[PDB]
Enzyme design. Structure first.
Site, PDB file in Angstrom:
ATOM      1  N   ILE A 146      44.166  42.442  41.866  1.00  0.00           N
ATOM      2  CA  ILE A 146      42.859  43.082  41.847  1.00  0.00           C
ATOM      3  C   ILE A 146      41.954  42.408  40.814  1.00  0.00           C
ATOM      4  O   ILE A 146      41.664  42.985  39.760  1.00  0.00           O
ATOM      5  CB  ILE A 146      42.915  44.588  41.512  1.00  0.00           C
ATOM      6  CG1 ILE A 146      44.040  45.296  42.235  1.00  0.00           C
ATOM      7  CG2 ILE A 146      41.602  45.251  41.892  1.00  0.00           C
ATOM      8  CD1 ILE A 146      44.438  46.650  41.645  1.00  0.00           C
ATOM      9  N   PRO A 147      41.497  41.182  41.113  1.00  0.00           N
ATOM     10  CA  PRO A 147      40.597  40.524  40.202  1.00  0.00           C
ATOM     11  C   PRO A 147      39.296  41.295  40.203  1.00  0.00           C
ATOM     12  O   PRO A 147      38.875  41.777  41.260  1.00  0.00           O
ATOM     13  CB  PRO A 147      40.396  39.167  40.857  1.00  0.00           C
ATOM     14  CG  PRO A 147      41.470  39.047  41.831  1.00  0.00           C
ATOM     15  CD  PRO A 147      41.678  40.390  42.334  1.00  0.00           C
ATOM     16  N   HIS A 148      38.675  41.440  39.037  1.00  0.00           N
ATOM     17  CA  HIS A 148      37.435  42.211  38.917  1.00  0.00           C
ATOM     18  C   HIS A 148      36.697  41.812  37.653  1.00  0.00           C
ATOM     19  O   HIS A 148      37.224  41.034  36.852  1.00  0.00           O
ATOM     20  CB  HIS A 148      37.734  43.703  38.873  1.00  0.00           C
ATOM     21  CG  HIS A 148      38.737  44.076  37.826  1.00  0.00           C
ATOM     22  ND1 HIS A 148      38.377  44.437  36.548  1.00  0.00           N
ATOM     23  CD2 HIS A 148      40.090  44.124  37.864  1.00  0.00           C
ATOM     24  CE1 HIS A 148      39.466  44.705  35.849  1.00  0.00           C
ATOM     25  NE2 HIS A 148      40.518  44.518  36.625  1.00  0.00           N
ATOM     26  N   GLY A 149      35.490  42.356  37.474  1.00  0.00           N
ATOM     27  CA  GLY A 149      34.580  41.944  36.394  1.00  0.00           C
ATOM     28  C   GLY A 149      33.255  42.694  36.343  1.00  0.00           C
ATOM     29  O   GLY A 149      32.962  43.521  37.191  1.00  0.00           O
TER      30      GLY A 149
ATOM     31  N   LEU B 215      36.927  43.342  42.882  1.00  0.00           N
ATOM     32  CA  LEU B 215      35.941  44.355  42.532  1.00  0.00           C
ATOM     33  C   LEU B 215      34.947  43.875  41.489  1.00  0.00           C
ATOM     34  O   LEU B 215      35.363  43.504  40.384  1.00  0.00           O
ATOM     35  CB  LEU B 215      36.637  45.630  42.020  1.00  0.00           C
ATOM     36  CG  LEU B 215      35.669  46.760  41.604  1.00  0.00           C
ATOM     37  CD1 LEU B 215      34.913  47.312  42.782  1.00  0.00           C
ATOM     38  CD2 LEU B 215      36.377  47.885  40.892  1.00  0.00           C
TER      39      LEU B 215
END
Lengths: 151, 151
Positions: free
Chosen positions: B65-68, B103
């Site tokens: 779940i890469p996100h930022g 996300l």
């Protein structure tokens, strides 16, 4: 960082809790936070349900992350509870829950809130770790492991 | 609610992507958001690393779940990517990653941010589901399933 370090104290690592209801744990989870914080035990439990009835926070395989917002809280708070007997929790996979780490956050949202819940999830999610938590008896060691995952 | 419904459009479901680097996916993930939103593809990829080098967002078992945070974003944005070949992602369990849902959220934090990341996590985390995503070829069906988990 360790990130669960500063919000989950040793006081808030509870080993083995003989208990029957989802309500029962939530009540006890209420007593824990009520101890190291001013907060009414009732408001914690009410608020957790005000989230749990909205959909289970069970993560699969005996693991849950019940959480919520609190009205007067100044910094987030966390706990960890093991259960003697896994309780029916309406988890995604149908399995009962015996491991759970609780998260309360203030009404006022932080960018950190996301990254702290996400660290928790990732931690419980990994099953190499999930086993260590399910077996460890030493309470000091269950704290060290919780608050030092990815250091 | 469906919760991933309003931020993860069909455009943003990408099936099978032949790719080699962690950087490579992040670059492509950048092109996806750049398509349905104004946002510079570069800023998305830079920002994801500005989180991934801070610690892996792999959740275990091919799932990430890469996100930022994004500077000008008005509402959160999400995507889903499958990979032909699972890539080395430094996941907690040592396994390569082939499934991942991205996300992005605005700088200005919402109470919802936590609950939307948590929904994603719980979804990827459950392995009954994890398999359906790993196998489904119909893109319409991979959208329906994503945006209708717990309805």
């Amino acid at each position: 960082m360790n990130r669960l370090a500063k919000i989950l104290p040793l006081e808030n690592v509870v080993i083995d809790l003989s208990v029957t209801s989802k309500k029962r744990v939530f009540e006890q989870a209420g007593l824990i936070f009520e101890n190291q914080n001013g907060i009414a035990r009732s408001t914690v439990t009410d608020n957790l349900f005000a989230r749990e009835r909205l959909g289970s926070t069970g993560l699969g395989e005996g693991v849950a992350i019940p959480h919520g917002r609190i009205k007067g809280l100044k910094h987030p708070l966390a706990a960890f509870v093991r259960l003697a007997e896994p309780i029916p929790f309406e988890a995604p996979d149908g399995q009962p829950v015996s491991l759970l780490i609780f998260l309360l956050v203030p009404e006022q949202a932080t960018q950190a809130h996301l990254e702290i819940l996400s660290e928790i999830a990732q931690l419980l999610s990994d099953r190499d770790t999930r086993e260590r938590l399910h077996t460890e008896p030493d309470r000091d060691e269950l704290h060290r492991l919780l608050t030092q995952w990815q250091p």
